Amino acid sequence: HHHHMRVSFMVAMDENRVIGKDNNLPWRLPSELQYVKKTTMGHPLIMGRKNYEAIGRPLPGRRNIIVTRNEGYHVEGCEVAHSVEEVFELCKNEEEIFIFGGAQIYDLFLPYVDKLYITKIHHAFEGDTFFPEMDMTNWKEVFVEKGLTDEKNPYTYYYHVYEKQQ
């Protein structure tokens, strides 16, 4: 609408939409992370404050934008926004931005998502944090591929990309 960048979600979730456990990731898939790095590289990452602090460091090659209500919050090598609109202001001339989680930030940007890069992990983890439900009416799957399952990547998972039609 009023904003001009493509708003993409980047997320990995399990069979029951779990994305987190005890303020961390419930699984380790190095190959899935490499897919994430390659796809997001050169584009802003929009992160909830909690998500960012668990990561602990600016992710290289991308604008790191942290979303917080804390008006005195500052991190070296990162930009801080306090609302959806402030993100939109900081990113006004960007081609595409990646909403990178976690759940509160996914909920925040849900009315604006144009494109969904969702990895689906075929396992039911114990967890406390969930990706929001989405009505996929007027969305089309434009990419799907099986993830690498091996000794280092011990679950079955698929990369999916959906694009909003309206």
Ligand X SMILES: NC(=O)C1=CN([C@@H]2O[C@H](COP(=O)(O)OP(=O)(O)OC[C@H]3O[C@@H](n4cnc5c(N)ncnc54)[C@H](OP(=O)(O)O)[C@@H]3O)[C@@H](O)[C@H]2O)C=CC1
Which parts of this chain interact with ligand EKB (CB under 6 A)?
10-12, 24-25, 32-33, 36, 51, 54-55, 59, 100-101, 119
Residue sitting closest to ligand EKB (CB):
12
Smallest distance, ligand X to C-beta of residue 2, A: 18
Q: Which amino acid is at 44?
A: P
Smallest distance, a second copy to C-beta of residue 159, A: 9
Positions 145 through 164 that interact with a second copy (CB under 8 A): 145-146, 160-162
Tell whether residue 57 is among the known ligand binding residues.
Answer: no
Q: How far apart are CA 143 and CA 135, in angstroms?
A: 18
Q: Please identify which residue in 8, 40, 51, 64 interacts with ligand X, judged by CB under 6 A.
A: 51
Q: How far apart are CA 156 and CA 71, in angstroms?
A: 42
Q: 77: number of CA atoms within 13 Å, CB side?
A: 8
Task: Verify binding: residue 140, a second copy, rule CB under 8 A.
Answer: yes
Largest CA distance in the chain: 47
Tell whether residue 105 is among the known ligand binding residues.
Answer: yes
Q: How open is the CA angle 90-111-9, to the nearest 5 degrees? A: 65
Q: 59: number of CA atoms within 13 Å, CB side?
A: 25
Extract the annotated binding site for NADPH.
Answer: 12, 19, 23-24, 49-51, 68-70, 102-105, 129
Extract the annotated binding site for Ca(2+).
Answer: 112, 114
